[PDB]
């Protein structure tokens, strides 16, 4: 039926959004830290 | 789809202004000023709720001591006597009977002295 659709259990998960308030856990710094090269937009160092 | 704001920001800010009814000046009008006062009010209530119990216990002891001084004996000496006899009546009930029935409190004082 098109008005009772249930996906398989354990097969769907909601994504994570950062910078959406402090109660979520990733509000201000969005999981980056404080004042570093890795805390800027543009990446860090090369994989090697 | 473009999700534009509306009827959500306004409905959430007016709840804070309603909680600040009766404040002085802009503290009941402006959301930014009123929001800070509500957080302070909540912090104060949590602290004062537990502090309220200490204040009322100290009031009963003061009234008990004054009533005991009229029988030529002290508060720290009276409470020691009651526990020897095992009266097991708290300060709240001791204070109420010391102003309602002054004759009833005299009976307890005599019993405490008998037990030394």
């Amino acid at each position: 039926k098109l008005h009772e659709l249930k996906p398989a259990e354990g097969s769907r998960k909601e994504r994570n959004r950062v910078g959406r308030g402090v109660a979520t856990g990733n509000g201000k710094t969005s999981g980056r830290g404080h004042k570093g090269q890795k805390a800027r937009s543009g990446g860090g160092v090369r994989p090697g | 789809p473009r999700v534009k704001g509306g009827t959500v920001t306004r409905a959430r800010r007016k709840k804070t202004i309603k909680l600040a009814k009766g404040y002085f000046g802009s503290k009941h009008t402006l959301y930014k000023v009123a929001k800070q006062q509500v957080m302070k009010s909540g912090q104060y209530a949590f602290r004062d709720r537990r502090q309220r119990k200490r204040d009322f216990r100290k009031l009963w002891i003061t009234r008990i001591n004054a009533a005991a001084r009229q029988h030529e004996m002290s508060y720290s000496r009276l409470m020691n006597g009651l526990k020897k006899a095992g009266i097991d009546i708290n300060r709240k009930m001791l204070s109420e009977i010391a102003i309602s029935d002054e004759k009833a409190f005299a009976q307890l004082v005599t019993k405490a002295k008998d037990a030394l």
Binding site: - | L59, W60, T62, R63, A66, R69, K92, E96, I99
Partner: protein, 143 residues
């Protein structure tokens, strides 16, 4: 919640008289201050005045201890640059015995709106006669 509270409609105030012959200044003041605050009554209420009026006779002829006659100094300031004044306890006792007793007692009371009013019920007289005979003051024995 059954704790009794006192208000202005069920409070009775009395008048007492105390003589200061051969009493230490601080020891007389310690007991007097507890009477003005109503701490000796069983219906004590911290936010309502429940005290009694106090009359103190013989402000003079009060005794100190040690060398307090000339080694106890009272300072004050007139809010002007360099203006500070002083007086000894011995000089103050014979020039103004009433102000000496008042200051010692009033310093033992809380400095609030209610405390500033409870100190208005104290009467100090240098001699041995008081003009408050219309009331019914009783002699008070110190504990």
């Amino acid at each position: 919640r059954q704790t009794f509270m006192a208000n202005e409609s069920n409070i009775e105030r009395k008048w007492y008289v105390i003589d200061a012959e051969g009493q230490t200044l601080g020891r007389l003041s310690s007991e007097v201050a507890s009477i003005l605050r109503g701490k000796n009554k069983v219906t004590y209420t911290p936010h309502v005045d429940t005290g009694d009026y106090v009359i103190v006779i013989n402000a003079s002829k009060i005794e100190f201890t040690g060398n307090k006659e000339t080694d106890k100094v009272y300072y004050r300031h007139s809010n002007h640059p360099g203006g500070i004044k002083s007086i000894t306890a011995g000089e103050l006792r014979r020039t103004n015995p009433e102000r000496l007793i008042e200051n010692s007692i009033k310093g033992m009371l809380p400095s609030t709106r209610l405390g500033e009013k409870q100190g208005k019920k104290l009467f100090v007289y240098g001699g041995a006669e008081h003009p408050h005979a219309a009331q019914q003051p009783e002699n008070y024995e110190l504990r």
